[PDB]
Design a protein around this nucleic acid. Structure first.
Ligand SMILES: O=C1C[C@H](c2ccccc2)Oc2ccc3ccccc3c21
Lengths: 290, 328
DNA sequence: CATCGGGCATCGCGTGACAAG
DNA sequence: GCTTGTCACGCGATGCCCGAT
């Protein structure tokens, strides 16, 4: 068709859609301001909106509104610790609905004092020397919770915040700080263990077989997941597979699944020998559902 | 003068007075058009009306002024710890709110995305999925969003469906809006950035127990020299899908002094797998083997999986994938 | 208690200048 | 040198207000 004419009509349509958008926004403003929706023209709606915004009023949201949105989205509590000693510099009130602990228990504490001892080492690895993401077990007999932490390393002190002379923070002199959020949270698979039974390699198909993620098994002994009436049989199988190197030993036992159910599993086990010194590197296991 | 222009000037005066009150820096306000001026005015009003009904401090026992200053920024601190951005989306797929950090992850300005169709930011093939997540409450899914940074970024959305009060729909009850946090994704593998000629050499005992390592090796694998020799032989470092290949090539090296090119995965100190193309040589002393010198070059995941697809021997566990740990 | 014409105010439409990209 | 969009402007068709019937 005529190029000039279709350009003209497209432009007219664009302007008409712009006008319609403007009037729709005017109607939204009339719906949003106080006594407009209790009808007026465009100018009065605009003046009343101007007055209402003058009443209401840089960031689009206040700090508390942003915090509210984040917490409503995915819970969590903010903690700022020092990377030197783990000293808890700040902790929000959200630690109470998350860990069932008052703010006082964390203030004057250190991050290592609030999580499981077996994780302390790991936390050091996460605190030595931008983004950080890890999983630990925090306190609340003592009871622990798996807590996922996502945060970042920030130069201390922070900008904008005043640090008075008589403040407890005035003498610490920390250079870096971790600012993070903590939140509550028939196939087969192969695995490699040490001669004592500790999961040192876990196939990803574990999820489809026992319901665990690989990280939930690595480091733990396989006997911890086995039924007590089969624990000694499994331990004897692991003991004898070491003595008969290269030989394959099969053992059937009950495995505690993710739902804490009992799954009957057949485990084939043999040893991997160093091709120079013939020493056992690890035990290869194929664990199959039955 | 004439009546039409006078009315238009009265409208423009009201529009500019609306713009001067928007909660944005003036360099953002000055480059706004009238349409987005009205749009973000509506957005501010809707947000304030929602927070008036949904919203409303350190313990007085734990009150110091420095802690008070930290509390007055707690919101920005959470936002920066998100590693991503906030997104509140109405039932009409309109962006009720998006935090500023979206610009850091997608390149879109906050003032341009608020009160707009969220589908404009989402890949078409994924839009339907998002809609199915917009209609128990807790939500956890993945979507590819448009990325203008320097074309699309896959992102994990973790959120909830909650009633968006104070919207004055016509009087309709509030609709379920999605409050979510969008974060990037994760791979468990180390690819070098300066990949090219990052060849590093390692020294080993005859049983492939590390004894020395060069600087580039400490950079690639992430172990210190002392840490590399305290975890047993190198077979504790090898992916379970490569242990038999490494053993076969170790036998070859024992037999003829040279192993040949072998592609396999080493376990970093971050418990990640990194591909290496290696060649293990036997050094001698008085005619008897003394130690091993292995010169490795890091590979990308692409070249590594190509080598695995073109594997010489067919061996058990060849296509197995998994995670590992290492102790001393 | 309306109804009726004045003249100015609202308002939607199409087009042209102008500019970012 | 083309495309999409913003802003202003001219222009009628109704709107509102209000003396004057
Ligand atoms: O070259 C290596 C790397 C590695 C290693 C390097 C650094 C740290 C830990 C482990 O062990 C090996 C074990 C068996 C091999 C067989 C053939 C060729 C190379 C190897 C190698």
């Amino acid at each position: 068709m005529d190029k000039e004419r279709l350009a003209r009509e497209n432009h007219s349509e664009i302007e008409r859609r712009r006008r319609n958008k403007m009037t729709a926004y005017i109607t939204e403003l009339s719906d949003m301001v106080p006594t407009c929706s209790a009808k007026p023209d465009k100018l009065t709606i605009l003046r009343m909106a101007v007055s209402h915004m003058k009443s209401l009023r840089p960031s689009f949201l206040t700090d508390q509104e942003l915090k509210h949105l984040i917490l409503e989205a995915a819970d969590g509590f903010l903690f700022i610790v020092s990377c030197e000693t783990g000293r808890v510099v700040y902790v929000s009130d959200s630690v109470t609905p998350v860990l069932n602990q008052p703010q006082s228990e964390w203030f004057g504490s250190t991050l290592y004092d609030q999580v499981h001892p077996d994780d302390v080492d790991k936390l050091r690895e996460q605190l030595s020397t931008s983004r950080r993401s890890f999983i630990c077990r925090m306190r609340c007999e003592p009871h622990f919770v798996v807590v996922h932490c996502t945060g970042y390393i920030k130069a201390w002190p922070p900008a904008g915040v005043s640090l008075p002379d008589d403040d407890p923070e005035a003498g610490q002199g920390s250079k870096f700080c971790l600012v993070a959020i903590g939140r509550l949270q028939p196939t087969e698979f192969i695995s490699r263990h040490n001669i004592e039974g500790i999961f040192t390699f876990v196939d990803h198909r574990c999820v489809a077989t026992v319901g665990y993620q690989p990280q939930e098994l690595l480091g733990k002994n396989i006997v911890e997941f086995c039924h007590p009436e089969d624990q000694q049989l499994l331990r004897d199988s692991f003991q004898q597979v070491v003595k008969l190197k290269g030989q394959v030993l099969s053992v059937m036992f009950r495995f505690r699944s993710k739902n804490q159910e009992w799954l009957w599993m057949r485990t084939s086990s043999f040893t991997f020998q160093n091709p120079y010194s013939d020493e056992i590197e690890y035990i290869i296991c194929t664990n199959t559902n039955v | 003068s004439n009546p039409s222009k006078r009315h238009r000037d009265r409208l423009n005066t009201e529009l500019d007075r609306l713009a001067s009150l928007l909660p944005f820096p003036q360099d953002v306000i000055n480059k706004l058009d009238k349409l987005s001026v009205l749009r973000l005015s509506v957005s501010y009003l809707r947000a304030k009306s929602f927070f008036d009904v949904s919203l409303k401090g350190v313990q007085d026992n734990c009150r110091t002024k420095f802690r008070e200053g930290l509390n007055l920024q707690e919101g920005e601190f959470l936002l920066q710890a998100l590693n991503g951005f906030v997104l509140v989306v109405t039932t009409d797929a309109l962006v009720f709110y998006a935090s500023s950090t979206i610009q850091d992850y997608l390149g879109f300005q906050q003032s341009d995305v608020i009160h707009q169709s969220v589908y404009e930011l989402i890949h078409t093939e994924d839009r339907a999925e998002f809609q199915r997540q917009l209609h128990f409450m807790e939500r956890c899914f993945v979507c590819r969003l448009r990325c203008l940074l320097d074309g699309f970024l896959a992102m994990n959305f973790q959120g909830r469906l909650k009633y968006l009060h104070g919207q004055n729909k016509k009087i309709l009850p509030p609709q379920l809006a999605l409050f979510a946090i969008a974060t990037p994704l994760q791979p468990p593998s180390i690819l070098e950035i300066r990949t090219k000629n990052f060849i590093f050499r390692t020294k080993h005992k005859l049983d492939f127990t590390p004894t020395g390592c060069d600087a580039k090796g400490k950079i690639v694998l992430g172990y210190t020299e002392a840490e590399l020799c305290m975890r047993g032989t190198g077979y504790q470092f090898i992916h379970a899908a490569d242990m038999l290949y490494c053993a076969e090539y170790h036998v070859r090296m024992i037999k003829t002094g040279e192993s040949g090119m072998i592609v396999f995965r080493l376990l970093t100190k971050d418990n990640r797998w990194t591909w290496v193309q290696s060649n293990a040589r036997l050094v001698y002393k008085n005619g008897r083997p003394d130690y091993i010198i292995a010169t490795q070059r890091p590979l990308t995941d692409e070249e590594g999986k190509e080598h695995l697809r073109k594997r010489t021997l067919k061996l058990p566990f060849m296509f197995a994938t998994g995670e590992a740990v290492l102790y001393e």
